[PDB]
Design a protein around this ligand. Structure first.
Ligand SMILES: *[C@@H]1O[C@H](CO)[C@@H](O[C@@H]2O[C@H](CO)[C@@H](O)[C@H](O)[C@H]2NC(C)=O)[C@H](O)[C@H]1NC(C)=O
Ligand SMILES: *[C@@H]1O[C@H](CO)[C@@H](O[C@@H]2O[C@H](CO)[C@@H](O)[C@H](O)[C@H]2NC(C)=O)[C@H](O)[C@H]1NC(C)=O
Ligand SMILES: *[C@@H]1O[C@H](CO)[C@@H](O)[C@H](O)[C@H]1NC(C)=O
Ligand SMILES: *[C@@H]1O[C@H](CO)[C@@H](O)[C@H](O)[C@H]1NC(C)=O
Ligand SMILES: [Ca+2]
Ligand SMILES: [Ca+2]
Ligand SMILES: [Ca+2]
Ligand SMILES: [Ca+2]
Ligand SMILES: [Cu+2]
Ligand SMILES: [Cu+2]
Lengths: 699, 704
């Protein structure tokens, strides 16, 4: 019942025509736009309000209007703004409202605007045509200069030092064919100022070569020709790992393949997955990325919403690009930068794969093929098991099979894997792996307070990753409270021999009444059992709870003292529980990246000393680690050990383990024929006949 | 050097050591399965691991292998001062000698009460409970419990309150057919004193019924018939979950099954597993449990030994049984209590399964069928992957497949799953799940400071699970140090706009020089990068490291203040790194369970202020969680979320990710046909390369 389905291609074209016809002429296609134009940057699903949605899904009411949200760069005017416009209803839009002010209390400063694909292209024209030839002598002598065809540019982080700046540090790298350029930094770094609406007016504020700072490329080339700059010649091709992805070893016998002996045990219709146990809807926001809604275990709802909010990456280093860099990846877009899943590599070969349609930086809706995969996975583990050789002879267990939804977001070098996994015990696991290439610096000098040499001439820069999740649990209805259970030892005299002492173990329950009590900072410890719960109880009279259980190796957060830190105040928390308000739909924003100093959304604002005793609650989970890159990250960072996320786990929510009622259960007694088919289902063509491999392709 | 030094004893070898001991132990030597306290007894015979010097000498430098010997534990009960003794017996397979290492190892005789409780001993206790004692309470027992064939006993933990005690609290439970009796405690608990060598002399120290203490079952029945006890009728049958394991739902369509399209890609020969990438030996200690030795990635050794050392379970509760209970399961035995893996449940259906032979509390070697399973598992995840739409058009990834060894130890109610999993990146994951049934109390009174109601009349008692692992890494040779890498922010002026401040991120490396510095307590925080390393370095000049990365939600440890805490000192640590000594083989002992007050091994002794700069090092990793039982543990505790253990991860050990050279890797350009077979191995699985096997007909390893 498809309220939460990302927009169809029809629905996008429809909103795009509507916007065209009503936004004034002189409306330029975003992929070609200059700063001083008008521009549709984004069109995408605007999620409905929760009231109306549940009204419809639970109480049969009519659905809420299906609307879209378009971001429009209004560059052609005295005071340029960015504007968010709601456009509905679908599929025949008749209205368009400008929610900008009602939402962020004022206009959106034009510098918060994400850097357009055209803008990057215009910056590379200035760099390679006007600027770089001024240093053609150095670049011949260090990096095989040709007129800028062999070199290539990569963005950084927040752009400038202060609200309203738009000055970006750019590294230069060899333009490696068929493998990651990110490892071949050439040592040159340019602070480009591109705030102006007129690209002609763009300057080059600073330069960095090989340990030293200059004021222009002309000054650097003065100092080189004056023989005053020791230049080293950096190789340009090479072999293995640092240069390739292609294995030299020929393919061996084949890895284990999984198939479904008697057909799949789940279906995907549109945005809705359904199985014997689990029902839910799914999607990608363009900037927020993955999300699932209306998660229903055996037909009862557990969560209204679980959704990625933000990923973050804080670097340090020798060079100015590295030490400035704090990527707030929502400002690029986790959904925009989704990539095709490659069958049999990113997901089981036999998974069902679904496309994703989007309208971003174009006026055509485009489509990313195989963006999502959904599949059942046999884990190899038992979910549960007991073998009794004692007093009575029996065995009873159950191999865990798991249901899984996966997207992958390729933000330049990094490939983020997002997983939503659905256990047959009633638990939901959320997971986040980082693979892909490292972002690297040129090796020079004081290295080692800042990272590891990881190839010739390559410094693997130290950095943290963090990601933020919204968990809108509705545990047995809307009104939830949060409990914190834990443990304690209490010295006591042994009752039946009181001259003797015994350390008496005891549970510890405190009911958290206030937002501030449930806001938990990185660094401080936290209750071992922490769960959202209901007024209602299970058979045995305990409050029905879903428990959050995290998996994080937190990096130390950017210190509060920094002006920047407000653009990601969620980084400072492990976990926070909050009154769930419509005015507070998201934890970061697409506009924080390019101005964290005046944050377009500041998460610490949500924690504001209200009650959380019997309210519609939402948990916010931070997860992440520290990364000191090392030789085994070349060519890619591996998944092993880097899984982070959390478990949502039943806690007296049921009256017993629901897997007890599993169809795939197994039991037998000592006195039975354990290998007779009427006692044991395991005791019973040309099996998997496979789809011919396909690929979603490239840009 | 081609020998299998690390192989659990075969059955011929066990019979041989048994025969030898028989002939040479004096006559009047009784079979342990039928032995009384005052008898002589062979409790255990099992492989004695060789000394490291000699073993490597052989394995690396070609020298001859060290004498393969066995270690027998012998209960010497027939004498003025009864001892336990450990005897080495070799060489095999034709033993010619036997020495009594008891004194040489633990500085003195082994006090007889440290001995584990024999199967006969438990039976003699049950004879005293059901024949002599329990009928004195026959009135009560009719009224409440449908009265001694319908009831059944279960042990506890340390036995007493003081070194030398041997008095055990025993719960009484309905003798439920075909499902866990552990959930049906009837409310009666008997403190039995069985220290004496004459079972006739055994007493019943105290009694506990439904909230109240009494001095004997006779005085309980006085007060019952005097109408002075409010007695609670506890049902005897029931349905679903609290009573069954058998699902009422009929089998549906089949779950995913995994097979190897063109043969297996590993082999098990005896104790030795071998694959394209990983080569290692494996076994069970009878009491220690799981262990692997001589682990070699692509031919180079990473670890000499990884071995379970102890599991622990500290309980609390309303009732005396629960609040006393601290299991040190080594004292029962993780190997002894291994159980058959049930194919297609405990491991993949097509995994290769291996038996385990043992001689314990008998004179015949017996065999546990399907005790281990080894298998490759496709994980679904990529190990690694990158899709470039930027500047150049390519794709390069690799689905992670993994190699796995698994044993399962069923210690009465609990089924521990031990996993050792071998990633193709060079990492080694160690894992530990607990499923099975909960140990439960009768629900009564101020419950809730002590756990959760989990069925009618059943309290799920709170507890902690902790396990201890020995990790003897030999990173690029024997001489290792430990480094602690971490991070810091340093306020600074932005160099190009000094007016402006920037929070400067930096790496932090300190080299830990002393044992105490690398001993990290539960509760303390602890370096984010902690690794053992070499004098030697990789191509780029950083020291060659394997890094320990833990996965623990540790309970608070038993407070030091308790006399008992010495028996498991390792609980108090997350991690410790130690000079690896032969005198210090193991972290716990089979003899701690029944006397933690005077501990037969005390782990804190190992941490004693020596250097760990450039020595043969051994890390000790504790892992564990808190468990407040809850409805969803009925009938069994589930695995999901309760995986605990650690990763051993390369850290500038190689010059690059070795999976770069994988056979299973995948790459193609934008300008290529991604679905052509000469470009992409995956575009042939259909065409021809499928065909699921005919499966082996299901078998089962059976029961006692
Ligand atoms: C941002 O700019 C847009 C136009 O570029 C503003 O919207 C227009 O406002 C005028 C009156 O201010 C109307 O007559 C038009 O019909 C409006 N067009 C639309 C689509 O809104 C908008 O007011 C500006 N926002 C702010 C807060 O400055
Ligand atoms: C533990 O018990 C054994 C016998 O039960 C003792 O061993 C015997 O000791 C006598 C005299 O020392 C010898 O002549 C026997 O032949 C020994 N038997 C064996 C096989 O060792 C043992 O010495 C006792 N240990 C201690 C320290 O009490
Ligand atoms: C970079 O290299 C690729 C192929 O190796 C080429 O197709 C592309 O046009 C080059 N130029 C730039 C700067 O993108
Ligand atoms: C316990 O139950 C089993 C039935 O499975 C039976 O064989 C046995 O006799 C019963 N009695 C005792 C005390 O074990
Ligand atoms: Ca709030
Ligand atoms: Ca809620
Ligand atoms: Ca020592
Ligand atoms: Ca070592
Ligand atoms: Cu990283
Ligand atoms: Cu438990």
């Amino acid at each position: 019942s498809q309220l939460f389905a990302d927009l169809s291609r029809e629905e996008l074209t429809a909103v795009m025509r509507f916007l065209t016809q009503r936004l004034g002429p002189g409306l330029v296609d975003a992929a070609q736009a200059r700063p001083s134009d008008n521009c549709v940057f984004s069109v995408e699903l605007q999620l409905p309000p929760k009231a109306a949605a549940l009204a419809h899904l639970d109480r049969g009411s009519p659905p809420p209007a299906r609307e879209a949200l378009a971001i429009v760069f209004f560059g052609r005017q005295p005071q340029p703004n960015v504007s968010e416009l709601v456009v509905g209803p679908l599929p025949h839009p008749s209205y368009m409202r400008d929610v900008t002010v009602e939402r962020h209390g004022g206009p959106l400063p034009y510098h918060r605007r994400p850097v357009l694909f055209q803008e990057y292209l215009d910056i590379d024209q200035m760099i390679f045509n006007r600027e770089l030839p001024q240093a053609s002598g150095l670049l011949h002598h260090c990096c095989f200069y040709k007129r800028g065809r062999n070199l290539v540019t990569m963005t950084t982080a927040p752009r400038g030092l202060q609200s309203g700046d738009r000055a970006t540090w750019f590294g230069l790298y060899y333009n490696i064919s068929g493998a990651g350029f990110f490892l071949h930094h050439v040592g040159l770094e340019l602070l480009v100022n591109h705030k102006a609406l007129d690209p002609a007016r763009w300057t080059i504020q600073k330069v960095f070569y090989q340990g030293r700072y200059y004021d222009s490329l002309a000054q650097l080339e003065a100092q080189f020709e004056a023989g005053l700059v020791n230049v080293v010649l950096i190789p340009d091709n090479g072999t293995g790992g640092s240069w390739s992805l292609k294995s030299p070893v020929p393919p061996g016998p084949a890895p284990p393949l999984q198939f479904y002996p008697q057909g799949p045990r789940f279906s995907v219709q549109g945005s809705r997955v359904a199985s014997s146990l689990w029902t839910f809807s799914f999607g990608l926001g363009a900037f927020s990325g993955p999300r699932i809604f209306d998660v229903r275990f055996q037909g009862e709802r557990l969560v209204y919403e679980i959704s990625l909010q933000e990923a973050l990456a804080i670097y340090g280093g020798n060079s100015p690009a590295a030490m400035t860099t704090r990527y707030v990846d929502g400002g690029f877009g986790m959904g925009k930068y989704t990539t095709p899943l490659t069958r049999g590599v990113d997901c089981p070969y036999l998974a069902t794969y679904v496309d994703w349609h989007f309208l971003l930086e174009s006026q055509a809706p485009k489509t990313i093929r195989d963006a999502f995969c959904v599949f059942e996975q046999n884990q190899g583990l038992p979910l549960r098991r007991h073998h009794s050789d004692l007093y009575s002879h029996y065995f009873g267990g159950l191999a865990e099979t798991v249901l899984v939804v996966r997207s992958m977001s390729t933000l330049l070098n990094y490939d983020y894997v997002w997983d939503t996994v659905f256990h047959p015990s009633g638990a939901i696991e959320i997971r986040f792996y980082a693979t892909g290439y490292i972002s690297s610096a040129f090796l020079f000098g004081a290295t080692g307070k800042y990272g590891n040499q990881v190839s010739e001439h390559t410094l693997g820069t130290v950095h943290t990753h963090s990601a933020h999740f919204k968990v809108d649990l509705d545990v047995a209805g809307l009104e939830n409270w949060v409990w914190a259970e834990d443990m304690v030892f209490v010295p006591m005299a042994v009752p039946w021999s009181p001259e003797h002492q015994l350390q008496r173990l005891q549970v510890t329950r405190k009911l958290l009444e206030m937002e501030e009590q449930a806001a938990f900072l990185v660094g401080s410890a936290t209750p071992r059992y922490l769960y959202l719960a209901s007024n209602h109880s299970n058979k045995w009279g305990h409050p029905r709870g879903y428990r959050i259980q995290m998996l994080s190796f937190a990096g130390e957060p950017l210190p509060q003292n920094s002006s920047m830190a407000r653009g990601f105040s969620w980084e400072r928390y492990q976990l926070a529980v909050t009154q769930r308000k419509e005015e507070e739909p998201s934890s970061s924003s697409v506009f924080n990246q390019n101005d964290p100093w005046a944050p377009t959304v500041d998460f610490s604002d949500f924690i504001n000393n209200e009650t959380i005793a019997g309210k519609d609650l939402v948990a916010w989970v931070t997860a992440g680690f520290l990364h000191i890159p090392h030789a085994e990250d070349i060519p890619n960072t591996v998944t092993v050990g880097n899984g982070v996320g959390f478990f949502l786990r039943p806690y007296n929510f049921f009256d017993e383990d629901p897997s007890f009622y599993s169809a795939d259960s197994i039991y037998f007694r000592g006195d039975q024929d354990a290998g007779a088919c009427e006692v044991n289902p395991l005791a019973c063509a040309c099996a998997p006949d496979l789809p011919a491999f396909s690929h979603g392709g490239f840009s």
